[PDB]
Design a binder for this molecule. Structure first.
Ligand code: OGA
Ligand code: MG
Ligand code: NI
Ligand code: ZN
Length: 331
């Protein structure tokens, strides 16, 4: 078995190997990359996402989210308070202001320490989940807006035609902006490209050990666990690396820098934070190996998790027993 310890692997594809996306995901899996739940892909030196980022200030963040924490430093939940719209230009200025800027620090390790120590006492503002793309239309390789769709994957594998579309999303982050512990909708893969700015630190649990995270989460968020048998789908819970280590949960961490891709694999729980002003683009995708995970994915039916239009068909085809209950939670 390749990568039995479930370490996060880092890949350096050549320009030749960067031509066929599907083939390269399959190659990574042949090397055991999926065991970690997360991989990093450094693009070949000849590749570029776009020519410059000079003209992005006019993108609108229609609903910036202020991330307000409750709990203790290592075990907290966060809720999103909607703020008034602002442009990327305005957001970047806000990120760099004395109230929100990255503090002085020695290295990534020191900054991580300051994150887990102090995150709960601040409420950073995240421009998340903005439909759109920053890839140049002429970028042919690993262009997240030109991937084969999940609907076409399901059709190719299962022979059923379904409605739905699959498009990327932009994330504008600042110091301490946080993504809570989650897997993807229907335990899909995700791919995330850090277009510009400061880094993003990631924590991941190997898919083979995801249920150990869930069990600990039920213990740490006992009211939430009573409200819903899949409350991590709400994407509100944070658990620090110190807490995970105390409770023997296997995990890994890695920091993503501008110009790098991360791939999350089916049922790879991940969480993390941004180091300072940045812009990422991410999209879900599927492979044939995903199908069995989609059939087994937990679902939130309490009403909180509320997701896209396109998830309907996935639940309807892959999880027909669950469909009625799940849809009641959507409606
Ligand atoms: O970048 C973020 O805020 C969150 N991204 C992801 O969870 C992902 O790409 O799967
Ligand atoms: Mg613009
Ligand atoms: Ni994710
Ligand atoms: Zn729920």
């Amino acid at each position: 078995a390749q990568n039995p310890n479930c370490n996060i692997m880092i890949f350096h594809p050549t320009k030749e190997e960067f031509n066929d996306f599907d083939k390269y995901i399959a190659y990574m899996e042949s090397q055991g990359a999926h065991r970690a739940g997360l991989a990093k892909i450094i693009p070949p030196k000849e590749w570029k996402a776009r020519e410059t980022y000079d003209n992005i200030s006019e993108i609108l963040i229609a609903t910036p989210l202020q991330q307000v924490a409750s709990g203790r430093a290592g075990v907290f939940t966060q809720y999103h308070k909607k703020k008034k719209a602002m442009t990327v230009g305005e957001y970047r200025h806000l990120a760099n202001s004395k109230k929100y800027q990255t503090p002085p620090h020695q290295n990534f390790e020191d900054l991580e320490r300051k994150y887990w120590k102090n995150r709960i006492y601040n409420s950073p503002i995240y421009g998340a989940d903005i439909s759109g793309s920053l890839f140049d239309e002429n970028t042919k390789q690993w262009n997240l807006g030109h991937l084969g769709t999940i609907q076409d994957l399901l059709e190719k594998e299962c022979g059923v035609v379904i409605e739905g579309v699959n498009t990327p999303y932009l994330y504008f982050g600042m110091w301490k902006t946080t993504f809570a512990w989650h897997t993807e909708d229907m335990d899909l893969y995700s791919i995330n490209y850090l277009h510009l700015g400061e880094p993003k630190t990631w924590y991941v649990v190997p898919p083979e050990h995801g249920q150990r995270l869930e069990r600990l989460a039920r213990e740490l968020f006992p009211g939430s666990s009573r409200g819903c048998g899949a409350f991590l789908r709400h994407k509100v819970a944070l658990i620090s690396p110190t807490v995970l280590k105390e409770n023997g949960i296997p995990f890994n961490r890695i920091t993503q820098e501008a110009g790098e891709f991360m791939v999350t694999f089916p049922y790879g729980y991940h969480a993390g934070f941004n180091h300072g002003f940045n812009c990422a683009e991410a999209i879900n995708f599927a492979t044939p190996r995903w199908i069995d995970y989609g059939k087994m994915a937990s679902q939130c039916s309490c009403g909180e998790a509320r997701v896209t239009f396109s998830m309907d068909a996935f639940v309807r085809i892959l999880q027909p027993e669950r469909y009625d209950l799940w849809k009641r939670g959507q409606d």
